[PDB]
Every structure is written in C-alpha cells, then in structure tokens.
Design a protein around this ligand. Sequence first.
Ligand SMILES: *[B@]([O])([C]N1[C]=C([C][N]S(=O)(=O)C2=[C][C]=C([C])[C]=[C]2)N=N1)OP([O])([O])=O
Length: 355
Amino acid sequence: KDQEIKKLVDQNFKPLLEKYDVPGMAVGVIQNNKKYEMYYGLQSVQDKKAVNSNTIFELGSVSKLFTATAGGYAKNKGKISFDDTPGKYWKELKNTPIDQVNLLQLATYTSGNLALQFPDEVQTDQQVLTFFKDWKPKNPIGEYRQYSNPSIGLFGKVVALSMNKPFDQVLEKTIFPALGLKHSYVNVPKTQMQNYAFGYNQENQPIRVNPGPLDAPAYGVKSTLPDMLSFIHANLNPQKYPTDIQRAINETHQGRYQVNTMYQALGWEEFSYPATLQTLLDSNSEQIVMKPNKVTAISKEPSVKMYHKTGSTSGFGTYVVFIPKENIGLVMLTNKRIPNEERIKAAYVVLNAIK
Ligand SMILES: *[B@]([O])([C]N1[C]=C([C][N]S(=O)(=O)C2=[C][C]=C([C])[C]=[C]2)N=N1)OP([O])([O])=O
C-alpha cells in the first residue's frame, strides 16, 4: 500500500509544475516513521541542476516554526516566561508602550498594532529600535490578531537576548542540532552555496531572499527536504528527542486562542482533525492573513488535532502539515510560488488517500 505514496504525489503535486511553470519541487511524506522523498525538476534552470536531497530551499514563513520552537526551548529552560514583556530583555524598550505587550502576544500576533511588514524605510538596527520605541497601541492588546513579521520578529529577538546569543546562533548552534538537522541554515555557508536553489519570481527570473529587518525569525531559514521531514518527525514523535527540545516542541502545539475554526498555536496553525478542505483553505484567506480579526478564547478544545503552516518568499513556496493521531505529515518545497490553495488542496488529497 506504501507503493501508492509515490503515485498519489505524482497525481496531485506533479501537475502543479506544468500549471504554474515551476522549475523544481520536493515533496516529502512521513508515515509511521518511514520517509518518502519525491523530487521534480531543477533547482537551477540555467545550470540544469536537478532537485535532490541536498537541494536547499527558502522556507519563508515556515521559519516562524523554528522561532516558535526556540521560544518553547527558552521558556522550558527558564530563560523567559510568556508573561514577560520585551523590555525585560531589550532594555531600551523598558517602560515604552510596547513593553505592555507580553511575549506570547508578540509570538501570536496580538499586539493590536503591528502589520504584516515593517515600513520599507525601516532597515537598520537603529531604525528597528526606533520603530519599536515609537510604537503606540491601537486595538486592545491581546484582542485582535494581525499576522505580522515584526511581531514575531521581536519575539525572536527577545528569545535570542534571553539566551545571550544572536538569533542566527540560537538556531544554528542550539535548536537545529537538538532536532538533528544537518543542512538547515539562517546563513547558508560558502561550502553549501552550490546546493542553494535559485528561487524564481512571477516573471521566471532567478531570485533569492533579500536581507531585511528581523528577517531571520520571520522568514529567514533555508533547509532541505530530508531536514524538513526530520522536523515533521520530531513534531509527530517527540519521544525520541532530548527532553529540552521535547518540551519546546510540545509548547508549540498548544493552541492559544481561536479565530473560528483556526486555532493559533506557537508558529503552527492548529485545527480539529479531521478538517474540511474549506477549513484548511480559509485559514490562509485574505481576511485571516491580511486583515485584523478579533480573537476568542478556545471554546472547543479539539480532541484530535492537525497542524499546518504555509511559507513564501519572492521565489519560493513552502507548505508543512502533520496529523499526530494518524502518524503522518507532508512537506512541499518549490522554487517558485504557487497559490496557497493549491498547496493545501494537494496535501489534503494525498494525506486523505493514505489515511
Ligand atoms: B510568510 O513567508 C510571510 N510573508 C509572506 C509575504 C508575501 N511576500 S511573498 O509572497 O513572498 C511575495 C514576494 C514578492 C511578490 C511580488 C509577491 C509576493 N510576506 N511575508 O508567508 P505566509 O505564507 O503569508 O504565512
């Protein structure tokens, strides 16, 4: 029956390459502790270099899952509390209005006045500090979700301060090794540059992500399909992992609040399983992703849960999804963006057909 996984992935993912003119794709499934890796197309059109198990892709927003894990790790080590405010760690923010927002509210986008992106003019360390010092509340703190790079970027910066190391080193020296990841990076080293895919924009031009303010915690991790399968494996089966990372992983699975059928965990989106296709698609609707939404307390605590997260950079699309009770998960990495709905639907069909 496992002979069907390749066929399902071919039926559901492979057509997206032609449909969206995507040069390269890697799709992985993990089921019952067995990994299946499917590679398509080219990591570099100009070089005619094939996608394979060494290919490094930009994860975009899926990077937020690592930030959340790093936060869970620091919390379980006693380095932070989710009730603390940023000013406890970034001294220059002490006694400023942003110092009334707690770390959980930053991590889960509920400061009430932070948009998807910083302003284009905000670039340097100094401009970032100033942005946060000048910050003033809008909506009541904790009450409205607006998905935000700055919000979780500040979260990540505070996590790093609490661990007395720059955020890149928190991931590369502490979190990635604890997860057993061998080719995951904030900064891809010279010795791996040959493995780094080009991304391709909507005009099919090769592109890679540009440096930006607090980029690393928001959208700055790069990884391979095998490493992302290992990450899903850790999420499905944390028992094998060191206690510290185990608690960190568990921390990311805890739903914090609800927006109808979408529960916001740390980094991860959470849903009741089984979830309808429309539930999973609407989690990435314009309304949820781009606009403020007033949240509620979790009322229905799902007995059986599933989690997902999309990610995009200019030249790359990512989707990761796992379902603990079914012991299954899927990762899709492309070096061109395709609509979220296609990613989510393809994964839905595959995981349902294997279930
Ligand atoms: B995260 O990666 C956060 N995220 C996504 C975006 C949209 N930028 S983009 O989709 O990469 C893009 C770049 C260039 C052009 C012309 C269009 C779109 N900004 N921050 O991803 P999600 O999936 O939204 O959670």
